[PDB]
Design a protein around this ligand. Structure first.
Ligand SMILES: Cc1cc(C)nc(Sc2c(F)c(F)c(S(N)(=O)=O)c(F)c2F)n1
Ligand SMILES: [Zn+2]
Length: 261
């Protein structure tokens, strides 16, 4: 069992999941000392991200986040191999300190973070197999700040009061997942790291977009207050808050940027 708070929290993940104490761990603070421009980093292309509106996709509260299942025909092109999507989900803080992204930029958290998980489908039959191979996974990260309402993020958030408890599910009509991405997607940070949850496998090629998107005050507060880690009618609920990992050491290494500074 793992959590973000108390005896099963992140300083204890290495007891059940040894890779959480291993090398290449994410997330990290993206700061000047550790950045270098790499002009060979080209734009990713996002294929099949305009999901059919006549199809539904499963939204689930899994006890650790809210996750939307994504289809195999969605992928990114541009890496050595094609990577196919498997799911997206979010990380956030809480209303008294609404700074719960995973990655930080020059020490600042953002309000929340979206992850769109993909696996190397040219070399591996599924995401479980890929998850133990170097560069087996590729995750896209979008930093989220509070400001303007976001109609495209609302296609997910409008369902939150109906997946309040662990194990609950909703169906979301397809919509264009590219509208969750920020401006200037050609500008990003790129590095080799790990899953930021157990089992913390060091097998993720990260792409964190440079620019954040905005969601409203009301949307961020729904995300921070609607959900629980526990089942309905568990007599001692646990609020799903602060489900982000602290930044990790990152020494002797570099994050590559597709933008110059
Ligand atoms: C290790 C493994 C195997 C499989 C099949 N899916 C997953 S899904 C997943 C994942 F791949 C991720 F990269 C992450 S994250 N926070 O984006 O690092 C995650 F939370 C996840 F839930 N992870
Ligand atoms: Zn994540």
């Amino acid at each position: 069992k793992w959590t973000y708070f108390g005896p099963d929290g992140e300083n204890s993940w290495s007891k059940k999941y040894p890779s959480c104490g291993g090398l290449l761990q994410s997330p990290i603070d993206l700061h000047s000392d550790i950045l270098q421009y790499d002009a060979s980093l080209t734009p990713l292309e996002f294929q099949g991200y305009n999901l059919s509106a006549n199809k539904q996709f499963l939204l689930t509260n899994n006890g650790h986040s809210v996750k939307l299942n994504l289809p195999s025909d969605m992928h990114i092109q541009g890496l050595q191999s094609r990577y196919s999507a498997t799911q997206l989900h979010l990380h956030w803080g809480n209303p008294n300190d609404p700074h719960g992204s995973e990655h930080t930029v020059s020490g600042q958290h953002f309000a929340a973070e979206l992850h769109i998980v993909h696996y190397n489908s040219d070399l591996y039959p599924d995401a479980s197999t890929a998850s133990n191979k170097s560069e087996g996974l590729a995750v896209l990260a979008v930093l989220i700040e509070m400001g303007s309402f976001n109609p495209s993020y609302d296609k997910i958030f409008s369902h939150l009061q109906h997946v309040k408890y662990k194990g609950q599910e909703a169906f979301v009509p397809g919509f264009n997942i590219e509208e969750l991405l920020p401006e200037r997607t050609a500008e990003y940070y790129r590095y080799r790291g790990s899953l930021t949850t157990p089992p913390c496998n060091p097998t993720v090629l990260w792409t964190v977009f440079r620019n954040p998107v905005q969601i409203s005050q009301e949307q961020l507060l729904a995300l921070e207050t609607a959900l629980y880690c526990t089942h309905m009618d568990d007599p001692s609920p646990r609020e799903m808050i602060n489900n982000f990992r602290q930044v990790q050491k990152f020494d002797e290494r570099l994050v590559y940027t597709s933008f110059s500074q």
